[PDB]
Structure 1
Amino acid sequence: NAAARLNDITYNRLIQGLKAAGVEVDRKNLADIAISDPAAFTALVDVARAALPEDVNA
């Protein structure tokens, strides 16, 4: 959640977008990535944001 909000997105929508993109990276490895490779975490954020639907409230 800390890393996601650093990249300007909520944990809610980050998880939903990763599920939509079909990325099955674990939460443990997601946190490890967040601490170790911030650039990789940012790339994952862009992927999830793209996979998110156009309007999440419909």
Structure 2
Amino acid sequence: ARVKRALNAQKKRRTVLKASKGYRGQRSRLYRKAKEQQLHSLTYAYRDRRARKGEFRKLWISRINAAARANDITYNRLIQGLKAAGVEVDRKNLAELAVSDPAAFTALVDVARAALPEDVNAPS
């Protein structure tokens, strides 16, 4: 029973086109070559869906370093003192505070410095 191949093909044509909506030039017009960049753009989606966490943690660390230096301490020392004091706050909250409440950031850095041992070069 010969089946005429119209509706099925058009469904997927339109679905791919819609998913490609908003691309450049003919790339949102020609299905034979929208597929190329639907597939690509989604490959990038897959990869950066994790790349984003790395990038954001990088930005947070940079902001924290800036805040620590403005408060006269280096980021690594801030982290070391904070850990040695056994705080459980992470760098996302660190950065958000550092840009929101400099007073609280100052208090936290004092806590870190106080928890910082006397000698930093001790072999023990």
Whether the TM-score (by the shorter chain) exceeds 0.5 is yes
Q: TM-score when scaled to structure 1?
A: 0.97
The 4+ residue runs of structure 1 with deviation greater than 6 A are none
**How far apart are 1:12 and its partner, in Å?**
1.1
State the secondary structure of the residue aligned to 1:25.
coil
Identity %: 93
Provide the secondary structure at the position in 2 that maps to 1:57. Answer: coil
Distance 2:113 2:83 in 1: 11
TM superposition shift of 1:20: 0.5
Question: Which structure has the highest helix share of the two?
Answer: 2
Please say which structure displays the higher CA radius of gyration. Answer: 2
Question: What is the aligned counterpart of 1:19 among 78, 83, 86?
Answer: 83
User: Which structure would you say has the larger RCO, counting Cα contacts within 8 Å and 6 or more residues apart?
Assistant: 1
Aligned alpha-carbon RMSD (Å): 0.5
Mapped partners of 2:121, 2:68: distance in 1: 20
Q: Render the CA deviation track for 1:2-35: whole Å, top value 9, x for unaligned.
A: 0000000001110000001111111000000000
Please, which runs of 5 or more residues in structure 2 have no aligned partner? 1-64
* Paired positions, count: 58
Instruction: Write the distance in 2 (CA, Å) between the matches of 1:6 and 1:57.
Output: 24
What is the distance in 1 between the residues matched to 2:67 and 2:121? 24
Q: Secondary structure at the match of 1:16?
A: helix
